[PDB]
Amino acid sequence: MLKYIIPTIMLMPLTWLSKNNMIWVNSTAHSLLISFTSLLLMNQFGDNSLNFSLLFFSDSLSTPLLILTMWLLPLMLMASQHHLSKENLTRKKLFITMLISLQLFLIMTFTAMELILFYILFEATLVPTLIIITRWGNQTERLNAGLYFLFYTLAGSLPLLVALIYIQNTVGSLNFLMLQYWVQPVHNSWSNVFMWLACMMAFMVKMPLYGLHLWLPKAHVEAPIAGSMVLAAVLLKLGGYGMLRITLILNPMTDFMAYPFIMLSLWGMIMTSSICLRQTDLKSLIAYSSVSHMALVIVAILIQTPWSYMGATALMIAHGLTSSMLFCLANSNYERIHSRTMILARGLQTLLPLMATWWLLASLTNLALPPTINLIGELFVVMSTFSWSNITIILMGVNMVITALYSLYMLIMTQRGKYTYHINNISPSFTRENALMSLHILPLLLLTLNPKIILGPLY
Amino acid sequence: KMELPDYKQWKIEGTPLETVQEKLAARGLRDPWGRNEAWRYMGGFANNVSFVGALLKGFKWGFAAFVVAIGAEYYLESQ
Amino acid sequence: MNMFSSLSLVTLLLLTMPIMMMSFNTYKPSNYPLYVKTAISYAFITSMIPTMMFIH
Amino acid sequence: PLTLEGIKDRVLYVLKLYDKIDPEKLSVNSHFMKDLGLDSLDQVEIIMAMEDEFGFEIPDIDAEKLMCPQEIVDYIADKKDVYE
Amino acid sequence: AHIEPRYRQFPQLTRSQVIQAEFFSATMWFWILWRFWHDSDAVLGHFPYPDPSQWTDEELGIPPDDE
Amino acid sequence: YLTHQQKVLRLYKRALRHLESWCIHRDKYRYFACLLRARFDEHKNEKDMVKATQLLREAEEEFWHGQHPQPYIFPESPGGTSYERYECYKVPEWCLDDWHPSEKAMYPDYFAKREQWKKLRRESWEREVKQLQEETPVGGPRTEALPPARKQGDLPPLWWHIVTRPRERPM
Amino acid sequence: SGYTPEEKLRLQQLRELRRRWLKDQELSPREPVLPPVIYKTYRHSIFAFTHVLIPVWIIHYYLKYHVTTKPYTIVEKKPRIFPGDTILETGEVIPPMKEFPDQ
Amino acid sequence: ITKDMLPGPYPKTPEERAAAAKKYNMRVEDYEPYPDDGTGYGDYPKLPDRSQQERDPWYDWDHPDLRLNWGEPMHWDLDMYIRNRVDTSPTPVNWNLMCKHLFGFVAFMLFMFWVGETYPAYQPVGPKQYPYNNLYLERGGDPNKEPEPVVHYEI
Amino acid sequence: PKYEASRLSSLPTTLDPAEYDISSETRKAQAERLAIRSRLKREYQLQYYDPSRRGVIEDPALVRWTYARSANIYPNFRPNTKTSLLGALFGIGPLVFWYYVFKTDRDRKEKLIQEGKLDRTFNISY
Amino acid sequence: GAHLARRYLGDASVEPDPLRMPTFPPDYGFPERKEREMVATQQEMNDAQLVLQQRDYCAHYLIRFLKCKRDSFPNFLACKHERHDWDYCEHLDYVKRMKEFERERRLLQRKKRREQREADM
Ligand SMILES: CCCCCCCCCCCCO[C@@H]1O[C@H](CO)[C@@H](O[C@H]2O[C@H](CO)[C@@H](O)[C@H](O)[C@H]2O)[C@H](O)[C@H]1O
Ligand SMILES: CCCCCCCCCCCCO[C@@H]1O[C@H](CO)[C@@H](O[C@H]2O[C@H](CO)[C@@H](O)[C@H](O)[C@H]2O)[C@H](O)[C@H]1O
Ligand SMILES: CCCCCCCCCCCCO[C@@H]1O[C@H](CO)[C@@H](O[C@H]2O[C@H](CO)[C@@H](O)[C@H](O)[C@H]2O)[C@H](O)[C@H]1O
Ligand SMILES: CCCCCCCCCCCCO[C@@H]1O[C@H](CO)[C@@H](O[C@H]2O[C@H](CO)[C@@H](O)[C@H](O)[C@H]2O)[C@H](O)[C@H]1O
Ligand SMILES: *C(=O)CCCCCCCCCCCCC
């Protein structure tokens, strides 16, 4: 992975040694080049994973997440450079440095072979993320959002640290390849119940599981755009990726320990989907949409079937691009009217025709129109949960109806109807904004032509 | 630019608006807007077909063609 | 079979061409509706050939 | 394609077919109450006849203010963006 | 246009629309009459419907009571 | 906010429109329109206003019982089939300020005249504000009514968004 | 219950401005100043060539040389065979049905 | 917006009620907060539970599509009462009568369909007869197990 | 036959008996309502018509509404017999309900599979 | 209809059950009852690819008609004679089913009659 770690590190001297007026041009260009080289991780085999060294390996799960991570960095620089224009040069470079350091931690997190190494990098991503929200967030409540984000994570991740160290004492290793062969079944006992909870709760809080999700709508409403993009696109998936790995060593206890969390997710997705119908803040609505989509991923991971694991992987990639798009679309309205209230600016299709097309395409992927990878992932999960229990189709089906209602409600309210009379500063869409939208949707829709590369190891 | 037809020509006499005026006079009333409706009962609008007349549009020539067609068919078969 | 299958697919591909031309390649916006209407009428002709083969 | 004179002709055409108005003492400035001696029930019927004539509704709050043919012509020209 | 609107009067009509409309109305009635002439069974009945009460006990294999 | 007279005249117009919806045929509607007008005429000169209010209340109950469940609506009236149909084509005039110079170059005459209107609006605004100040009582306006211009060369206060509103058929 | 004299004056003044604004929406003669049966068959001839002949060439080439070179990609229902038919592949003759009872 | 212009806790004294009414641009005689339970409405006004569709469509609203005026207090459930969503307009037929007639119609039909299944219509014919042991082989029958014969006779 | 109002069908204004019995005290209140509306209308129109303005006319009523519908709830929340019973009834209850629905369904299915009475003849995708 | 009124309002015991009939042996009252002949063989119907519900005792007429249709293309007004022969055969088939119903009905009425005779001693 050094071929990706080192050029990612080199982005920092590049940004600090650039001409004052070329920091965005240089950092954007070269992080796109890094993104290009990340397609070499597609050398995946039918049986064995791509095992680079003692520290890092890649397989069909981490590879799509790695490519999404490295693609998002140039998109985040594009999205941020406008609202940061007044910021002084040194603080602009510090912002870019936090984004670069976040990518470095993420690519190491997704390829770490040893689980304790994964833990440290999994935890390291908090620091830059918290700095981005609290330092460059706009409103007073970013400080509270920083605290809720920090302490929800640590409340769960500290027990995970104890469990992981305990496993290494008992098994002798935390290398994931070793655990694949030395895994022993988890017997029933109260000690093992709490070992299971310690191994899972940290990832649940990040997903987030319904009931532990209240930190996420806060974080989004306060974060700058780049913070929201990385939060929705990648940082939520640290939980899913972690769960997909650690469930290896929790069998067969997961058979019954998953029940409370399947109930929370199955009922949670309908609650959060219903909540979206009444949200008044556009960022908050998109945030609640994420909780509903990720509730599907939790269920898929917990029932552990080949179809559910393939659907979970596709959903994680598909949601990453869609939710990042939706935040970017909402932000482009914010940069004009400086309010997140959904009902403030209406009938924008009359004033911004092409931006309304991006709004339509994003909404259609959010409601999972076939054959988008959003639908492929959701469908594979629905198929597998039907076998788990036929009654789940009723809950899955109801959520599909509610998802369409709130996705189109968001499109109708902001883009259709009559424009607001007094809002007279809706200037035409910039080339930057249009390019940013298309750099989300185009790879998303292109993936429909070759979905296998985002279906994960079980493919 | 547009020539409105002379307003004086619009009279209710001979139309079913005249029947209504007679009915109203039996009660001591009068309809003052009758001439504003008169155009609907005059000119090219005076005679509309009945429902059976509407369904039979084209029946005469359809029957004429049909009769000629079967007579020809009787001839060809006869030979 | 070669004519039947080839012509049945050409009907569907014919209908997608006016959509592909929205990429401003060789477009004549003056009368896009006529262009779309002409594609439908030509697709109807091509679809009658395999339809005729099925009836036979 | 309505014109100001076209609107005026049709407004006066309708009023000349109303039995309660003498067609010779009617001008574009005749006041329905102070000149032609009509009452408010009569005025409501006139507005309804204009609505039928031009095929659109005049709300009660605006309708009650139109008290001469010219005001009706002005009201209709405004709603229909007629400037010639 | 070649058709100018009229006020409170029957509209102007072209010969094409009147002749074409009558031809297709006449075509409808010829077709019905022509089809009814040759295919009246499609409307009235193809085959006779028998009366089951007129079938003898012999042909239905009904033995006499004392059998 | 409605007087007794306004309430009666609104019911008369409303009752006739529902009557017309029931009758359909013009000769039939004319007949019953005169019968209904007679009913309003018998109580035209009622003086005891308590009785007049009771007559109005009973008439409204009668209207509610006998209203058409699907009355005729003019196409562009609220609830009509063409209501708000052309709102998607109405674009505010401030959008022309964001046109690219090459777009403006296609209509040199329109945009020269547009600048004259913007100049007129700019030079009129201060006087419009002042007129409203000096004509408004201390505690602010008590009604939504606005006044005309008083001097020559003045424009009626707050005229721009009325004069420059989108056309009813803007495309 | 008509306009007050002040209402009448305001409406008249706005009406003068509105009509002037609407007149100013008319395009001048030069606007928009823009920057720099034989035919019928040919129109339909070029369309048939580019939208039927070229696509069918591509589809036939694709079906013949890529799709039908793989198993079970195009599967036909086997032709119906009736009593009295002759087979082209073998020359086999299918025997007729029995003699029908009179009816 | 200062904090004195933002929603506050439920008002207790009459002076708080007057202050809250003014902040919300209401007459103190009209202002009425939601009942003080644990719900969390604070001092936000309770306004009539009416759809925006019921508002006068001919008045010159600052927001014609919503039928709202700038500065007027918004109903707590305004987003549920937009014209695209819940309507509370008067109906020509009483609500309770409509529910009676609709349910009565559906219940009657379901009963008759059940009746019609118990007493089906059919023609006076015997079963359709098929050759070759009721097409035993054609219907996928096992060709190694001889079927129990099905014989049909002339009539 | 009197009009019966419902939550989703309001009483028509013309059938409202309070609509006609209008006192001088009720006309005074209607005048004060129109004064507040007119005062706000003027404040809005002075900004709406200002030729030099470009942006959004911030509406405190809209800000108060979005603030009330979120940040203002918990400060004015009191744990009591109502919110606790509604909190329990619609917070824990559905999870327990669905747990038993799915748990019962899965126990029945697993018992049939082990006994070999569930038809899984062609079931090889899961 | 008529038979339905008798069964549902009248005495259901003397009316056939369309879902159970026949309830008497085929040869009961029918000395030397012949078998139904079948002209088309199983292989012929299989090769002609008739719908299973069409593989009845009239299949030979349907096969003859189907061959004519293919041979007379593009003249879709031909094969009227062959179509009528198949339609007519199906009519005779339907009449035989009417005879089975009527036979069953009269046997039930005889069964009841004998039971009145038996228990009236
Ligand atoms: C033996 C241990 C020590 C190892 C040291 C190895 C590196 C030594 C580098 C010495 C030269 C550093 O150069 C010094 O810093 C930066 C980058 O050049 C320059 O100043 C910089 O300003 C801005 C960025 O802030 C940019 O326009 C551009 O990067 C540069 O002009 C200074 O004008 C220069 O004086
Ligand atoms: C279950 C696993 C995760 C559990 C995580 C729980 C740990 C605590 C997380 C939040 C820590 C924030 O720490 C502190 O919390 C309180 C509210 O909670 C915040 O305070 C906020 O809510 C309180 C209570 O309504 C208000 O009085 C206050 O005005 C408001 O700012 C503090 O400003 C913050 O400094
Ligand atoms: C395969 C065969 C299919 C059927 C083919 C049948 C073809 C028949 C063509 C008939 C053409 C008739 O054409 C139309 O006839 C009607 C007869 O009312 C004429 O209408 C006539 O009567 C009406 C009033 O009744 C008057 O306008 C006028 O006296 C006269 O025009 C039309 O002026 C003429 O245009
Ligand atoms: C081929 C058609 C097949 C479908 C036919 C279905 C028809 C079945 C209709 C059943 C529903 C009738 O329901 C019944 O209607 C009557 C008449 O309004 C109601 O009767 C009541 O309402 C009316 C009107 O307010 C009042 O006179 C009084 O309050 C009371 O009589 C009953 O309260 C209701 O229970
Ligand atoms: C005789 O050949 C049958 C004709 C069908 C008659 C159907 C009668 C329908 C009457 C209502 C059905 C009520 C439910 C039993």
Side-chain angles (χ1 to χ4, degrees), chain D residues 4 62 64-68 71 73-75 77-78 81-84, chain G residues 1-4 7-8 11 14-15 18-20 22-26:
Chain D
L4 285 177
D62 295 344
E64 86 203 357
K65 294 200 211 322
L66 315 185
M67 265 319 169
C68 68
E71 283 162 5
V73 173
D74 290 326
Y75 186 92
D78 199 53
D81 308 322
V82 178
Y83 56 101
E84 300 190 318
Chain G
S1 89
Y3 297 116
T4 67
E7 277 161 353
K8 251 257 187 181
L11 285 180
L14 295 169
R15 155 158 64 253
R18 173 62 168 180
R19 289 178 185 178
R20 199 139 57 72
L22 289 172
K23 171 131 213 58
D24 285 341
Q25 307 308 293
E26 302 192 339

Side-chain angles (χ1 to χ4, degrees), chain H residues 1 5-9 23-27 30 36-42 44 50 54 59-60 62 69-72 74-76 78-79 86-91 94-96, chain I residues 2-4 6-13 28-29 32-33 36-37 39-41 43-44 47 57-65 67-69 72-73 76-78 80 82-83:
Chain H
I1 323 296
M5 278 302 104
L6 286 171
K23 155 171 81 192
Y24 288 110
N25 294 314
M26 308 189 57
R27 283 156 28 77
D30 295 333
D36 191 358
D37 42 40
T39 305
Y41 286 100
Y44 198 87
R50 301 173 95 66
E54 288 187 80
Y59 170 88
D60 189 52
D62 295 334
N69 271 336
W70 183 92
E72 84 176 294
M74 282 165 83
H75 196 276
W76 178 275
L78 184 280
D79 54 321
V86 167
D87 202 357
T88 69
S89 292
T91 58
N94 280 329
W95 179 269
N96 278 339
Chain I
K2 307 303 303 312
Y3 194 90
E4 292 136 50
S6 196
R7 185 195 317 273
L8 307 177
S9 49
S10 315
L11 171 77
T13 195
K28 186 146 170 113
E32 292 185 5
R33 286 186 199 110
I36 293 160
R37 174 158 117 251
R39 175 178 57 76
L40 292 156
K41 181 69 64 159
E43 181 179 0
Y44 170 69
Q47 302 171 82
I57 305 177
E58 167 153 78
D59 188 353
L62 185 63
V63 169
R64 281 195 284 278
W65 181 67
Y67 183 99
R69 280 286 294 284
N72 197 43
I73 277 147
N76 317 131
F77 147 74
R78 264 199 339 292
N80 65 343
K82 190 47 47 213
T83 64

Side-chain angles (χ1 to χ4, degrees), chain G residues 43-59:
Chain G
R43 200 297 191 191
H44 278 245
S45 196
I46 175 51
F47 187 98
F49 177 78
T50 48
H51 282 68
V52 175
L53 187 51
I54 274 158
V56 81
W57 279 343
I58 285 162
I59 286 158

